[PDB]
Design a binder for this molecule. Structure first.
Ligand SMILES: [Ca+2]
Ligand SMILES: [Ca+2]
Ligand SMILES: [Ca+2]
Ligand SMILES: [Ca+2]
Lengths: 410, 410, 410, 410
């Protein structure tokens, strides 16, 4: 379901642009795919063998960027789709990168710390000559954290000398960047502000309904409340609360710290966990799950702006229903692009050898998001479509233009 | 059918040797697999994209060796099986190599000469950092000839300087080896001589029935007739002849040069093309097709020695029927190993910078084949099996021993 | 004629500085010269062979910088002179570069696009190990444009990995720099402003006569008119106009867009194309051809400041006549140095991995030009000469000082 | 005069072979040419600058081979001609090499030992990345000896690690080869024996007239006398002797050791130094100077076989006069090829890491010379020409065949 959205959108964007068939066929085939065998001895002494993989889609615009995934179940079609999506997303945000995706087919909940370190180091030894500073830059993903990036950096340094810029997401004392934890919420807030200012409104004095308190949800809620807006509904995996005149987010954060839930809050009454999506509001921000909007919920919603901060929260039929209603949906390919931009900033800081302060990071992030939205709006106006197809058209056009400009060996 | 024989034989050989399960699992997983995209402009100007692949099984004993195939239809299971078979075959012949297999999914009958050269050069540019003199040595295969090796050598030299030993099968004036065309027939004759001398007989004064006149068939027939034997039946794709007192091979070769068939020969009468497999003879040598022996033909044959110079000419049920009859079958994993041995000799000559004469090549080939047969006979006597399982046991034992000796990262 | 000016100026500058003869002899001999053969198949199939060349003068101060020229007629003396001139010019502008010059002896008007791409790629393959990021950075020249730099970048990346900083002048979406088109006019305006402010005057309220509308001429005219000056005479290859109270440049630019000439303009009357060089004016700026000032015109001119924005517009006898008259001539070695400075900025941006905005580029350009003029004025005051010999003395002194500081192998 | 012979012979050989014009044009242009500046401080402290050069003609058959020359006067045309001649000569002898030639424009009679070492080391540092084991192998020439090769080896080893095979002609204890001093005389004797055995005669019982006692002359005379022939006339720079029944060479060698001349010998009477070229003899061997045969001497000679052991001893008109007379001339491109063959053997021994004995060297040299003569005779019979054009045709054909086989980038 998540792999068909990307390729359907690509076909539609290619139809809009009138691309040549040969160029589209060339944009289907990935630049390279690799499978290697990783065999380690356990703590007992016995051997265990896994299979590691790496897919690299395009490099027409610069180095390749992508995450390393530690999950037992893998599928080549899903991995190819994810690599292609990373390519388009990087093209949209206008950072000089490509797309990639890799991982190991193992379950990290069964291995101790030492075995996990051995597995990471062996994987790095096997793929050391296919990554690099200007070739391919791994990043952490699910099943992976900053410690794994530290181990990868250590092994690659053993091979090619001290290269701090080969990975992103490192700890702070190994060359990490400030402002990583709040990047996605900052990006969502900046995108929402730009979208609102397009129509002449502003964040100050509007109504927001936020679904979830992951990092994205809590940071977006805190930033919105600081800006001057009022939030009237909050969800979670366990519980949901409402307040018609605004919820004190600063109090709610410390309430969740101790209680661990949203039950028995002070400034708000509990509500059913299936109705907040239909509340009266100005902006609706889903941040937890994808596909939560479908045919049944499509007719009932009465929001005026939807910001897709999650991964694929909207189905196509619901999208057409909402288009006929008259609401505006910001695509997820652009809304949650704060993380990749901050990773690019960290890569730049490591290349330069000099670290920035947090203010510089935030200003650069704001500038990049605003410029991206202006470009997407112009491209949407040129071809007379909606925002999603504007984004995909812009990305595909950039990549195709670079590919044809670079050359075809005569 | 051809991919199940190799893995069934591996399972049986592992059962005989009592190998650990972990080591067998490690011997299943290939060392590396690669897919790349090769896009070229045609003579008109339009673009065409193909997908090239390369599988590298093991390198526990030295560099990797394998062929490049230009065939429209590909299958990962078949390619993996072929790479594994090359690994075992190299282990049997006792040359310091591993196993690999690669190719391009295109039909060379539709491309002109210039387009074919462009395709080869682009493929080499894409896989240049994964092959080498002591890493992986490509060889020609079906759809490929010596000119392709010349082009590969040229491009790799552009990248890494003059490296004549990166490929085998080059033309004679680019660093090729003498005695390449007659290698397989020489090997078959040497193996047959060793097998006969095992039981006390000799080639001089026996009866041979040879199926086919490819290079292998004609060279084996000529060498056998020179040695002192008599051949009494000859086949082809079109026609088959017989002579109870021996056929003049030296005359038959020039007869086929002009007529182009075996019809209306002087010293021999025509025969049905489905009965020669049941002729009275001492040695039967199939050289054209595989699977030609099955249940129907198994009971009728009355030969005393079968030499499998082709690829998989015997089915398992036929093999057991023949074992109960009491005949001896030389496995094809060992009989047709002349080509790889001569390729190894060419690699050695290019490493040394000094070319050998033909006599030295022939003496070395004879020594290697005799030593291989003595080793296979000893290993067959140790475990009380037949010749085929002796060969496979010897190969698997060598590879496993090297792998465990090399180390497991503690 | 253009090759004797540079070496005569070098001899005079060496005489002024009192340089050792050994050091001068060492500064004559170029660091390296290379000739290679470039053979390609045409679209028909037939072969064509050309000869490519590259001269690298000095590298005492950093990497080497120079242009690639596609012209049928070549001469080693001219190429050596151009490389030496680039060395001195880079030394004057105070950017850490050296000097070089290369090209191919072919006529690009006879080759199609595909053949031209093949020629560029083959040339790059032949000289790939003699250029680099910190070794030698090619730039476009006449017969060459940004597409050729894209092809060179592609081939060099195939060899040494992604290296965007190996060439300058790339397209914008491949890593180009903003503000390239207006660099030379900006530089001329900044130099003129500094020269005027030396004597206490200012651009606001003076009279300018500009010869030509190439990029340099139109940009200088537009910037001068914006600053507050008035232009009273304009030339072209076809036509010339005059207006005693100032010409609306903003209107003239759009007039030339449609009409394609300067005839029948609104705010100005046509004039003879051989008299504007003798108009009453404060500043005279030739921007089209060289050598336009000679003995006949030397006595007639009545300007107070001459800014040589073209290549060698003044002859020596005319220079001495003008010196006796009492006018001031800004040398061309310094006036048109905007292009190399902006190319250096692009190289820096590609090294850092982060692109600048246009304002930063313009501020840095202004700072560099002002500092260069102050240095040249100080050096001119030290030795009691004019501006041209001050420039050449400064450049030669910098290069000699670096060479002697670096060492002579004891 | 010496540069026109080679190119005239090339034109004639191309006319005989019917070569394409494009291929001939491609065979004119050298692969690469390099000029560098070599500046050293003298023993006093003052600086001296020279210009070093290196020309590399072709590498279609393997590494490049050529000599380093220390002579004050240089000429690009002469150097190009010498490189081309080395290419053809290597092609004739059938060793896998190309052609090159380099040197320094200095007079070694004015520099002390330390300054000469400094010059050699600086030259090596400047051209270190353009030579190598499989790229280009320098050799000593006039103005150069084995000590210079030792210094070059030392510097190149400092750069790229211990590489004993980068130069040939090293001292014996640094990896030199046995049998170097007598290589050319051995080669001349072997060639003469093959030429005589072509017509049915033999060396035993013939008459020889040898002009000169350089290394070639003395070694050829000693070997011929040992074989069973009789020498009846000997020349030198100072003096000439004759004996109708044979001269004791073993006594003459020790006579020259003490006296230092050929005057007052025991077994032979003095003769005029301008008549021995017209003596009655079977074989005439000039070994000292070139061009000694011309129109005046052409009609007077009465020999039956001429072996050109020197460099260009025969003029074209004299050649046609001698052809009409009916004598046979062995070309110098083949007669004196012993040195390059022994240098190739030394290169092979250094590549292998194991030194040969003298007997193996002599046997290999004999085999190579005999095979070369048989090939030249066959090629001469095919096209119905004389021996010289047979040699040049064979060389050009080999080089062109390799070039077209290697490829043209489609
Ligand atoms: Ca692609
Ligand atoms: Ca394995
Ligand atoms: Ca110099
Ligand atoms: Ca050439």
């Amino acid at each position: 379901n998540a792999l068909a959205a990307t390729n359907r959108n690509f076909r539609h964007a290619s139809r809009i642009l009138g691309l040549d068939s040969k160029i589209e066929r060339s944009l289907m085939i990935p630049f390279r795919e690799i499978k290697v065998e990783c065999t380690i001895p356990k703590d007992d002494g016995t051997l265990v063998s896994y299979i590691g993989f790496r897919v690299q889609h395009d490099n027409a615009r610069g180095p390749m960027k992508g995450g390393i995934r530690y999950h037992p179940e893998v599928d080549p079609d899903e991995v190819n789709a994810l690599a292609q999506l990373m390519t388009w997303k990087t093209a949209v945000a206008d950072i000089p990168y490509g797309g990639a995706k890799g991982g190991i087919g193992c379950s990290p909940r069964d291995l101790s710390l030492s075995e996990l370190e051995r597995l990471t180091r062996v994987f790095t030894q096997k793929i050391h000559d296919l990554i690099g500073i200007h070739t391919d830059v791994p990043a952490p993903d699910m099943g992976t954290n900053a410690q794994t990036m530290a181990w990868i950096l250590d092994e690659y340094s053993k091979f090619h000398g001290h290269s701090p810029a080969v990975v992103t997401g490192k700890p702070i004392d190994l060359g990490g960047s400030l402002g990583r934890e709040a990047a996605t919420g900052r990006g969502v807030v900046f995108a929402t502000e730009a979208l609102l200012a397009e129509y002449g409104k502003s964040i100050q004095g509007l109504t927001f309904v936020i679904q979830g308190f992951g990092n994205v949800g809590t940071w977006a809620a805190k930033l919105i409340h600081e800006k001057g807006g009022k939030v009237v509904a909050v969800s979670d995996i366990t519980g949901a609360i409402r307040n018609p005149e605004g919820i004190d987010i600063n109090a709610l954060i410390k309430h969740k710290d101790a209680t661990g839930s949203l039950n028995d809050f002070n400034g708000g009454d509990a509500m059913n966990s299936d109705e907040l999506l239909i509340h009266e509001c100005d902006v609706l921000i889903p941040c937890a799950l994808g596909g939560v909007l479908n045919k049944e919920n499509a007719g009932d919603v009465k929001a005026k702006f939807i910001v897709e901060a999650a991964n694929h929260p909207t189905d196509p039929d619901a999208d057409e229903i909402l288009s006929k209603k008259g609401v505006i949906i910001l695509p997820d390919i652009y809304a949650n692009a704060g993380g990749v931009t901050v990773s690019y900033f960290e890569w730049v800081q490591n290349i330069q050898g000099f670290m920035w302060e947090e203010e510089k990071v935030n200003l650069e992030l704001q500038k990049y998001m605003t410029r991206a939205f202006h470009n997407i709006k112009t491209m949407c106006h040129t071809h007379s479509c909606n925002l999603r197809m504007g984004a995909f058209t812009l990305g595909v056009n950039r990549v195709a233009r670079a590919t044809q400009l670079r050359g075809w060996e005569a």
